[PDB]
Design a protein around this nucleic acid. Structure first.
Ligand SMILES: [Zn+2]
Ligand SMILES: [Zn+2]
Ligand SMILES: [Zn+2]
Ligand SMILES: [Zn+2]
Lengths: 1482, 63
RNA sequence: UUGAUGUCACGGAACCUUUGUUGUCUUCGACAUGGGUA
RNA sequence: UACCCAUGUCGAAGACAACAAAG
């Protein structure tokens, strides 16, 4: 007989579990099996299926109970109740059967020998052991014994590593499953006790059960009595159907960024003009409408459901985008409890990678309910590391063997920490990180990754218990806890980038003496206050504060505070946030989150990784066991410096700046290269403040060499050499001052002739008052572009290279327009103000960079940096080698054509043919007349001069119908003939049968009718053919009455909805009753005049003559259709548009009727209508020398080049063989950072305005001036045909003149009439002449001639000027640059003044130009003539010709008459490549 | 100059010979390695001469 | 779903290295349409 | 199958190229 007591284990922590192993693997030799003998176990229902459930063996619980009983007997001198206990027996002779042996010492209380191996009476400790089944521990299982699919249904596997104390890097790791106590808190089992067991043994068992506090790796209390996949597939299908796959990875991440809130869907960006045509969210139903109904779903109303939905969607889209001994410790035992909080003072990173989520490279550890976890293992490891730091002795222990006996291990064996989680469950933030190639200055290959970051401000509960024989906590533990209470708790990974610094707050402690019987019994009764109720009761009696260490050692890290002050804009790029932000920009600055309570506050910051990288680059150029490896760490050793995020002192609102790239040929915007950015505004008047701090190890701070290195690097940073952030080339991120505090001044100690005038130009341009000159000209480049194989590297300051600064002043010689494009309605008609940054008038560094680059690319003959190489040109034909045809591998040839009247009233064909016959799919049967006979009654007083007899029949309405026989009676025909003078006067009476000799002539009359006209029944064949209807498309629409529409009689009919009901109302020529015309009115479109009444009919089909269509003809046809369907000048009414434009024909199909020209074998050109467009065989980039095209450019050849995608050598197919041109070596290319930075240009004095402002009290705002239409540059004019004789003439430069005066008066610069306001013209705020701006250009590693030629490109000569801003064709924007300061860098400390050595540089520059271009420097003279500012009292007349002379009151010839006169295609390129060549003499 | 090496073995490559193709693959892999590990060889800012023929040979190699 | 006179696994920090960066003037004039007469 | 032209309207570009993790 026996009694069963039921036992329940409640876990207060996530416990640990092993993996199921084969029944043969369950042996002593298996390392993994024996490593996991202190964990929970997984039970498989069937061997080959993972379905199962967790359990805990009774052997583990028995071992824990035995250990607790040893402790309790040691605390009570081995006396349980009256009875005493022997030390027990732990020696077995046949050790091999035992799976495990005791490697720990056995607690000793009494010295007598163990109980006899066969004794009638046994001590209670032996009964608990089992020497006398007296006590049987059973297995513990979940209540009800449920089943789960696998171990992953209850927990997750985590990697737990072991690091080296000296290096700070891990060297091995192991894994285990972690199961949450929130989901599986309780296990149940039974203990069976025989009736013969003594009551003392029962009391010992109960005490050991209440004293057992840890099991399976956790604190325990023992008591005894499919939408996401569908949405993803829909979005993917919409992406592929619209040919927008490239955006998938941008859509994958942005939608993931939506996991924070479902409200963010309503705040998704719209397009410019505010419509739903975003290039991402309106690709489709639109993707925005997919994500809007997904947010209204009842299932996804909860935040957690929305978060899981967004994460699943992002992961799916990302995946698609990718595709023994006996020792006595004594009776003195005390337990110290320390309770408090660990608050994150920096974002923290506890690394844990989930292999079912691959979108993020680095991930943080979370609980199943998406809370942040402070794992027990990390706290224990950090405590061990800090104890080793205190003792200064590493622990050289190895896994296995007897317990280590160093002070660190002795303290750690008495330490218990509790796993913690937060009340904050918001999603972690994602940070982008890259690595920069030191030589080129751009990112390395593959160096782009993501990192999940937990926010700062998260509060973790903290509890630590130390059990030991000492009076209280050890001195080392007190010192470590003092360090933690001061914020020196570096607990997480990624410490070098300021992650995981915690502070311990609200610390309370209490020591309990377990050597006292009363206190020990109270501790046993309340289960040691481990559960929440007992923990609260214990916390009510916790003493505030912590013990003060007797022997305190100083912390090893010291805080150095950084103050950065920047006089320029700043951006830390975050493209993903810019895609879900309502601002609708291309990039926004970095923003992080701070956890306040359970909410998240966004703050703008400078990332710690970026600052670390910039500083590391700074130290590595003024100079593995290198100084850099011992200061900043390496892949082998952890670093000694930890940089943190820098936050701005006063919160700046982001501002949006617009940029566009200008074609070097057309002088206009390049295709698809209009963008914007959202930096943080900075300026000299109101700089940006960046406050932060980093941490440096003391041993580094007391080393002279490391401090000297850091001091020189930070001195160079303070001197502006190293900009912060992105886009420094355009003046962003200039550090004006950097200050370091808190280093005892060990690092901070190290941080500490007029200009020659311009030469006068020799350029002479003679202006005559009679002539009128063109607004722009072209500089024909030289035939040679010098390239170099290897550009200079950004890796060091090379010897013999000049590094420094240029301070310059820009002066306005004519009015300047630099617009502020944030507001389009400053004064629908668009109005703009002058560019300002914080109410300070400025010119962005991008404008000045482009303006100076345009001249530097010309001074040094270089590549055309910006060029639309892939543009294909088209020309309109004029009113013979275009033959009819029907498609389709080949097109057949038709022999002849005829006009079939369709929109007249003479026929009823629209009734008598079906839709397919009209469309041209089915052949038709129509009579064709080719010649019409017209007779004179008398000999003329005419080559045929046919003479024949005529018999009159009838006369009515003047006309005479009669039958005529001629050709000696061979040919007889009937006709009607109107009365003709000198011929019909002979016949005055109607005898009805009179004979008369007459002369019949033949006139060409190519017509075809389905039924023969009843008037003329003679001379018609019956040939088959195809009817080609394009529709009524020859229309001359206008907003004002002309001649035809004004001569209309009656009310003007409305434009009919159908294009088949059109019928001719009026005739242009009424005397001869020809030129039929249909006239109509429609609202603002006003007057439509259709002058086309005959469609075309192709007959005599010759099938044998079919001609091949190569892919060139098809791509040219596709271009023709694209330009037809995307025409801004198209007629408003679609009934007057051709079928290729009316129905949006996107490709040629079999059976379509066309006009083609061909060679002997292949077709050369295909058009859909009689008079159409012709496309060029080459793209425009083939019209210039290969040395002139961009060094790194586009594919102009006939190859896809997408087959070699996912292969790197493709980049070598877009790069020039010889390297980089001088401009690409200085300003940079996509793969190579430039060596020049242009800063913002601030205005020195008060502004001078072109137009006086409305308010006299405000002199910082100016009056508005309205400009004429600004229209696209046309390469068609410069390159007037497909002949090879026509090339790209060169770089376009606009001349300096004063045409802006007429526009300031309000008159058109050509007609002289008023500029009437329209929705397309613009109004601008402009500055006047005499304004001075000051700006700064920074250069590094420049050869002497580069400085000389850059100085020349800035200053040029006196009598020369630059062009900046808008409306350069209207005279605005002449400026001049004079260099005021050239500072040169010789040492990190010494900077010399370089105003003296300006001449030599210039000369050397010119010397280079001599060896490059020997006596052939003629492009320089042309550029000089174009840069030529007109002299005083010398005012040229410069304007654009009008369309026609009738539109120009001045009588100057328009574009049409100029096309065939002075500007004929033959001499157009020579007149437009010769600077200052007139087009009108007046 | 890895790119000059690739150019030479491209101009001398015959696709029938396995040895030439293996050598060309070795040159391409060497250039890839130079790109991966930041070095001075990343300052090779040039392309390939005879773009149509080089493209044809590279596409045949990838086929 | 463990065996028993022998389990320091609270015996082990997923740790160490990496700059969201390189390149780009908010710029600008001749074009669009297809027929008609003999 | 030869000639002949006729009409006067109208905005465009709105991001592109590269890197998407290595040791
Ligand atoms: Zn005993
Ligand atoms: Zn040790
Ligand atoms: Zn090193
Ligand atoms: Zn170039």
């Amino acid at each position: 007989m026996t009694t069963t007591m039921k036992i329940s284990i409640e876990f207060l922590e996530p416990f640990r579990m092993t993996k199921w192993q084969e029944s043969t693997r369950r042996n002593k030799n298996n390392k993994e099996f024996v490593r996991g003998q202190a964990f929970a176990r997984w039970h498989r229902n069937k061997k080959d299926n993972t379905k199962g459930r967790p359990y805990i063996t009774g052997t583990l619980l028995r071992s824990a109970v035995i250990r607790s009983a040893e402790n309790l007997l040691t605390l009570s001198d081995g006396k349980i109740s009256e009875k005493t206990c022997c030390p027990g027996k732990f020696d077995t002779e046949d050790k091999d059967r035992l799976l495990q042996l005791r490697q720990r010492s056995t607690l000793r209380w009494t010295d007598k020998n163990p109980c006899p191996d066969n004794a009638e009476t046994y001590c209670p400790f032996c009964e608990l052991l089992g020497r006398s089944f007296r006590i049987h521990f059973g297995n513990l299982s979940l209540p009800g014994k449920p089943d789960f699919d696998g171990p992953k249904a209850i927990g997750s596997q985590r990697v737990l590593n072991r690091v080296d104390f000296k290096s700070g890097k891990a060297h091995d790791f192991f894994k285990a499953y972690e199961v949450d106590h929130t989901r599986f808190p309780r296990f149940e089992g039974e203990i069976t006790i025989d009736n013969k067991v003594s009551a003392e043994a029962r009391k010992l068992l109960c005490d050991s059960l209440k004293f057992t506090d840890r099991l399976c790796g956790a604190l325990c209390v023992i008591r005894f009595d499919n939408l996401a996949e569908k949405t993803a597939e829909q979005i993917i299908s919409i992406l592929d159907d619209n040919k927008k796959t490239e955006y998938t990875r941008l859509l994958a991440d942005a939608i993931r960024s939506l996991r924070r809130s479902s409200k963010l869907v309503a705040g998704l960006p719209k397009d410019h003009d505010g419509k739903d045509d975003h290039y991402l969210w309106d690709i489709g139903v639109t993707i925005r409408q997919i994500l809007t109904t997904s947010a209204d779903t009842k299932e996804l109303k909860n935040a957690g459901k929305w978060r899981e939905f967004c994460e699943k969607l992002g992961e799916a889209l990302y995946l698609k985008s990718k595709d023994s001994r006996s020792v006595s410790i004594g009776s003195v035992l005390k337990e110290t409890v320390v309770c408090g909080e660990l608050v994150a003072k920096t974002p923290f990173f506890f690394g844990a990678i989930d292999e079912d989520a691959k979108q993020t490279a680095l991930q943080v550890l979370l609980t199943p309910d998406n809370k942040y976890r402070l794992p027990r293992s990390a706290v224990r490891g950090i405590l061990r590391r800090d104890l080793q730091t205190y003792f200064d002795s590493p622990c050289n222990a190895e896994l296995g063997g007897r317990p280590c006996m160093c002070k660190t291990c002795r303290i750690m064996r008495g330490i218990t920490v509790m796993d913690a989680r937060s009340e904050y469950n918001a999603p972690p933030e994602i940070r982008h990180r890259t690595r920069i190639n030191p030589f080129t200055g751009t990112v390395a290959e593959g160096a782009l990754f993501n990192m999940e970051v937990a926010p700062e401000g998260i509060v973790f509960p903290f509890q630590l218990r130390y059990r030991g024989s000492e009076d209280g906590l050890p001195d080392a533990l007190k010192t470590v806890l003092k360090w933690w209470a001061e914020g020196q708790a570096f607990m997480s990974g990624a410490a070098s980038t300021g992650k995981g610094r915690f502070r311990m707050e609200n610390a309370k402690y209490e020591t309990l003496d377990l050597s006292d019987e009363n206190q020990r019994n109270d501790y046993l009764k309340n289960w040691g206050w481990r559960d929440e109720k007992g923990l609260e009761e214990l916390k009510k009696r916790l003493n505030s504060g912590l013990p003060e260490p007797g022997n305190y050692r100083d912390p090893k890290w010291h805080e150095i505070n950084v103050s950065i002050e920047m006089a320029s804009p700043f951006i830390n790029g975050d493209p993903i946030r810019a895609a879900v932000d309502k601002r609708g920009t291309a990039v926004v600055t970095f923003v992080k989150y701070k956890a306040e309570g359970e909410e998240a506050k966004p703050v703008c910051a400078y990332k710690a990784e970026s600052f670390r990288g910039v500083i590391r680059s700074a130290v590595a150029r003024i100079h593995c066991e290198c100084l850099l490896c011992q200061i900043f760490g390496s892949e082998y050793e952890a670093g000694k410096i930890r940089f943190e995020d820098l936050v701005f002192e006063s919160d700046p609102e982001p501002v949006t700046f617009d940029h566009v790239a200008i074609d070097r040929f057309t002088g206009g915007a390049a295709d698809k290269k209009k963008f914007d950015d959202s930096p943080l505004p900075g300026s000299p008047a109101r700089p940006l403040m960046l406050k932060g701090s980093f941490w440096i190890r003391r041993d580094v701070l007391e080393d002279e060499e490391y401090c000297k290195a850091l001091g020189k690097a930070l001195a160079d940073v303070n001197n502006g050499l190293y900009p912060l952030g992105g886009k420094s080339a355009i003046g962003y991120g200039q550090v004006k001052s950097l200050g370091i505090k808190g280093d005892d001044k060990r690092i901070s100690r190290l941080m500490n002739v007029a200009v020659p005038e311009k030469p006068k130009t020799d350029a002479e341009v003679r202006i005559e008052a009679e002539k009128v000159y063109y607004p722009h000209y072209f500089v024909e480049p030289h035939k040679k572009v010098e390239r170099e194989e290897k550009p200079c590297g950004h890796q060091k300051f090379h010897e013999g290279r000049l590094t420094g600064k240029i301070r310059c002043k820009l002066i306005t010689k004519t009015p300047l327009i630099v617009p502020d494009t944030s507001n389009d309605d400053f004064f629908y008609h668009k109005s703009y103000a002058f560019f300002r940054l914080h109410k300070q008038i400025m010119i962005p560094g991008s404008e000045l960079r482009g303006m100076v680059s345009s001249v530097y690319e010309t001074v040094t003959n270089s590549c055309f940096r910006i060029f639309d190489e892939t543009k294909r040109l088209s020309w309109r034909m004029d009113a013979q080698d275009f033959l009819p045809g029907r498609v389709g591998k080949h097109i057949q040839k038709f022999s002849e054509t005829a006009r079939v009247p369709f929109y007249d009233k003479t026929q009823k064909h629209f009734d008598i043919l079906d839709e397919q016959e009209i469309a041209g799919e089915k052949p038709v049967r129509m009579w064709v007349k080719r010649f019409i006979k017209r007779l004179s009654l008398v000999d003329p007083a005419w080559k045929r001069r046919k003479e024949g007899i005529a018999t009159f029949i009838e006369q009515k309405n003047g006309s005479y119908y009669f039958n005529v026989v001629t050709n000696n009676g061979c040919t007889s025909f009937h006709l009607w003939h109107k009365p003709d003078n000198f011929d019909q006067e002979k016949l005055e009476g109607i005898q009805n049968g009179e004979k008369l000799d007459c002369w019949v002539r033949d006139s060409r009359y190519q017509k075809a009718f389905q039924e023969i006209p009843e008037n003329d029944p003679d001379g018609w064949e019956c040939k088959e053919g195809y009817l080609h209807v394009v529709g009524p498309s020859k229309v001359e629409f206008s907003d004002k009455k002309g001649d035809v529409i004004n001569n209309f009689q009656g009310t003007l009919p409305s434009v009919p909805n159908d294009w088949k009901t059109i019928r001719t109302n009026d005739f242009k020529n009424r005397k001869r009753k020809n030129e039929p015309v249909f006239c109509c009115e429609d609202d603002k479109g006003n007057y439509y005049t259709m002058a086309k009444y005959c469609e075309t009919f192709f007959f005599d089909l010759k099938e044998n003559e079919e001609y091949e269509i190569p892919e060139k003809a098809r791509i040219k046809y596709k271009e023709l259709l694209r330009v037809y369907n995307n025409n801004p000048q198209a007629v408003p009414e679609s009934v007057f548009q051709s079928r290729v434009a009316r129905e949006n024909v996107e490709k040629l199909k079999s059976g379509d009727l066309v006009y083609f020209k061909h060679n002997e074998k292949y077709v050369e050109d295909i058009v859909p209508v009689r008079i159409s467009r012709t496309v060029d065989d080459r793209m425009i980039g083939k019209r210039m020398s290969a040395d002139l095209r961009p060094c790194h450019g586009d594919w102009v050849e006939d190859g896809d080049l997408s087959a070699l995608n996912a292969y790197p050598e493709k980049r070598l197919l877009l790069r020039h063989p010889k390297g980089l041109c001088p401009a690409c070596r200085l300003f940079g290319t996509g793969s190579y950072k430039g060596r020049v930075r242009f800063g913002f240009a601030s205005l020195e004095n008060d502004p001078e305005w072109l137009i006086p402002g409305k308010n006299p009290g405000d002199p910082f705002h100016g009056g508005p001036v309205m400009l004429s239409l600004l229209e696209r540059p046309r390469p068609t004019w410069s390159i007037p045909g497909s002949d090879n004789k026509f090339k790209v003439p060169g770089r376009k430069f606009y001349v300096h003149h004063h045409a802006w005066k007429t526009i300031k008066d309000g008159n058109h610069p050509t007609t002289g009439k008023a500029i009437e306001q329209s929705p397309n013209n613009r109004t601008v705020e402009a500055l006047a002449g005499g304004n001075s701006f000051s700006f700064e250009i920074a250069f590094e590693n420049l050869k002497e001639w580069e400085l000389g030629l850059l100085i020349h490109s800035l200053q040029l000569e006196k009598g020369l000027a630059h062009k900046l801003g808008m409306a350069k064709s209207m005279g605005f924007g002449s400026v001049e640059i004079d260099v005021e300061s050239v500072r040169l860098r010789k040492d990190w400390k010494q900077w010399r003044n370089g105003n003296s050595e300006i001449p030599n540089w210039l000369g050397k520059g010119f010397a280079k130009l001599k060896e490059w271009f020997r006596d052939e420097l003629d492009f320089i003279e042309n550029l000089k003539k174009l840069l030529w500012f007109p002299e005083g009292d010398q005012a040229p007349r410069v304007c654009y010709p009008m369309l026609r002379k009738k539109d120009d009151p001045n009588g100057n010839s328009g574009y049409e008459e100029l096309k065939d006169g002075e500007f004929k295609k033959e001499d157009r390129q020579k007149k437009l490549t010769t600077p200052w060549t007139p087009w009108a003499s007046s | 100059n890895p790119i000059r090496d690739i150019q030479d073995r491209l101009k001398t490559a015959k696709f029938d010979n396995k040895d030439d193709m293996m050598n060309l693959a070795s040159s391409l892999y060497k250039y890839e390695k130079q790109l991966m590990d930041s070095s001075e060889a990343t300052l090779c800012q040039q392309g390939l001469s005879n773009r149509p023929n080089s493209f044809s040979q590279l596409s045949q190699f990838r086929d």
